């Protein structure tokens, strides 16, 4: 949040003169906020539009600013601990399947929005079931791929 | 005629027919290529918009 201002003339403005000239749409693209109107921006001064103009070299830097070293990309995660995580999530799936069966059974038994409105406390097992996928996937895929590659590139 | 027609060289009175044909040694490399193809495909048609 940035702003840039300059003072309106020291009155002699009972003439009703505009503070500025206009020959473009270019200055009326933005809506002044209520707060500055409270403190009187168009009554005593005026705003001026901020613009950015980056040069070539700094923007070349600015993208590097997050790159991370090649050393890491080829590295494997430990296979132990990894298996532990797999078993954790798979055993977490059960309770959600059990709950899901009831949640399927009971719907349309009442008015439609009164499904959601009565589901603000207890969780809805669909989402928690779904978002444990995208954790077995992604993880298993990328680990198997990385091992499968580097088994060739070194000897 | 059978002997000199088919195999079983009867050297030390032995008629032997090759009936082992094990071959297929530990050959992880052919997996290492085609399985990579396979997994890349799994991830291909998983997030692309259908």
Swiss-Prot record, chain A:
User: What name has this protein been given in UniProt?
Assistant: 26S proteasome non-ATPase regulatory subunit 14
Q: Which family does the record claim for this protein?
A: Belongs to the peptidase M67A family. PSMD14 subfamily.
> Which enzyme type, at the first EC level?
hydrolase
What does the annotation say about its assembly with partners? Component of the 19S proteasome regulatory particle complex. The 26S proteasome consists of a 20S core particle (CP) and two 19S regulatory subunits (RP). The regulatory particle is made of a lid composed of 9 subunits including PSMD4, a base containing 6 ATPases and few additional components. Within the complex, PSMD4 interacts with subunit PSMD7 through their respective MPN domain. Interacts with TXNL1.
Query: What EC number(s) are associated with this protein in UniProt?
Result: 3.4.19.-
Query: Corresponding gene?
Result: PSMD14
Give GO MF terms, alphabetically: endopeptidase activator activity; K63-linked deubiquitinase activity; metal ion binding; metal-dependent deubiquitinase activity; metallopeptidase activity; proteasome binding
| Keywords linked to the UniProt accession | DNA damage, DNA repair, Hydrolase, Metal-binding, Metalloprotease, Phosphoprotein, Protease, Proteasome, Ubl conjugation pathway, Zinc
Entry comment describing in which tissues the protein is expressed: Widely expressed. Highest levels in heart and skeletal muscle.
Source species, domain of life: Eukaryota
Keyword DNA-binding on entry: no
One GO cellular component this record assigns the protein to is:
ficolin-1-rich granule lumen
Q: What does this protein do?
A: Component of the 26S proteasome, a multiprotein complex involved in the ATP-dependent degradation of ubiquitinated proteins. This complex plays a key role in the maintenance of protein homeostasis by removing misfolded or damaged proteins, which could impair cellular functions, and by removing proteins whose functions are no longer required. Therefore, the proteasome participates in numerous cellular processes, including cell cycle progression, apoptosis, or DNA damage repair.
Q: Which residues carry this modification: Phosphothreonine?
A: 111
BP GO annotations = double-strand break repair via homologous recombination; double-strand break repair via nonhomologous end joining; proteasome-mediated ubiquitin-dependent protein catabolic process; protein deubiquitination; protein K63-linked deubiquitination; regulation of proteasomal protein catabolic process; response to ethanol; ubiquitin-dependent protein catabolic process
Q: Which residues carry this modification: Phosphoserine?
A: 69
Swiss-Prot record, chain B:
Give the record's family classification.
Answer: Belongs to the proteasome subunit S14 family.
| Role noted for this protein | Component of the 26S proteasome, a multiprotein complex involved in the ATP-dependent degradation of ubiquitinated proteins. This complex plays a key role in the maintenance of protein homeostasis by removing misfolded or damaged proteins, which could impair cellular functions, and by removing proteins whose functions are no longer required. Therefore, the proteasome participates in numerous cellular processes, including cell cycle progression, apoptosis, or DNA damage repair.
Query: Subunit structure, briefly?
Result: Component of the 19S proteasome regulatory particle complex. The 26S proteasome consists of a 20S core particle (CP) and two 19S regulatory subunits (RP). The regulatory particle is made of a lid composed of 9 subunits including PSMD8, a base containing 6 ATPases and few additional components. Interacts with DDI2. Interacts with TASOR.
The name under which this protein is listed is 26S proteasome non-ATPase regulatory subunit 8
Q: Which organism is it from?
A: Homo sapiens (Human)
User: What is the organism lineage in this UniProt record?
Assistant: Eukaryota, Metazoa, Chordata, Craniata, Vertebrata
Q: Which residues of the full protein are shown?
A: 301 to 350 of 350
